[PDB]
Amino acid sequence: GEIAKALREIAKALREIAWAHREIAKALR
Amino acid sequence: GEIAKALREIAKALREIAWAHREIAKALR
Amino acid sequence: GEIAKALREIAKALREIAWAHREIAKALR
Amino acid sequence: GEIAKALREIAKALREIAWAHREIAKALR
Amino acid sequence: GEIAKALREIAKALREIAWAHREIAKALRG
Amino acid sequence: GEIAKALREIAKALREIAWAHREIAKALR
Amino acid sequence: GEIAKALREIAKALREIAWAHREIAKALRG
């Protein structure tokens, strides 16, 4: 469904943010 | 659908945030 | 619809956050 | 509707976050 | 409804984040 | 319901984020 | 359901963010 697909896009974007957030954590260490 | 379209706008905004977040990670490195 | 309108409000708020996030990236760069 | 109202509260909280994020950007400049 | 109640929990958690975010802004100014 | 339960999981994850965010505010102080 | 599964993916992604956020807090102290 289009609604479920859009919700999965939201999750994918958040995993993108999490990847960057882990890079920042490594950067500070 | 209007609901699915709006949910896709939410994902698009989060991708904007992820792009800026990657820029911040690069700056710290 | 009211639900779609509220979801677009969520998207716009995230676009506000993205603007500020870019401002932080510029400040750090 | 109750669901639409709750979604608007999510949007309002995100606008609170955006305001604070702009304050952080000001601090960094 | 259970769905509306859960969405209000989401909004409240975001309001918690906003409070902490304001605390961070205050610290960076102070 | 499974949808309400999943929404509560989203809320719980955000409360985890808020906890860490408060720890960061304390760290800066 | 597909919608509930997708919402659970969102929740898990936020838990990924929470873990990374805790690592940042630790880094600022350690």
Q: What is the resolution of this structure in A?
A: 1.8
The DSSP letter of residue G1 is -
Q: What is the nearest CA distance from D18 to chain E, expressed in angstroms?
A: 8
Decide: residue F6, CB within 10 A, 0-12 exposed, 13-18 middle, 19+ buried.
buried
Q: Token match 């960061």: residue?
A: F24
How crowded is the C-beta side of F21, counted as CA atoms within 13 Å?
22
Residue G13 in tokens: 């992604």
Q: What is the nearest CA distance from D4 to chain C, expressed in angstroms?
A: 5
Q: What is the nearest CA distance from E9 to chain F, expressed in angstroms?
A: 6
| Method used experimentally | X-ray
Pairs of residues, one from chain E and one from chain F, whose beta carbons lie less than 8 Å apart: 54
Q: Which residues in chain F have their CB less than 8 angstroms from residue G21's CB?
A: 17, 20-21, 24
Decide: residue D19, CB within 10 A, 0-12 exposed, 13-18 middle, 19+ buried.
middle
Query: d(Cα E10, Cα B17) in Å, to the nearest integer?
Result: 20
Query: d(Cα B1, Cα C7) in Å, to the nearest integer?
Result: 13
Q: Token match 């859009």: residue?
A: A6
Of residues B20, B24, B28, nearest to C18 (C-beta): B20
Pairs of residues, one from chain B and one from chain C, whose beta carbons lie less than 8 Å apart: 53
Measured from the Cβ of residue B22, the count of other Cβ atoms closer than 10 Å reads: 17
What does the domain layout of chain D look like in residue ranges?
1-29
Of residues F6, F20, F28, nearest to G7 (C-beta): F6
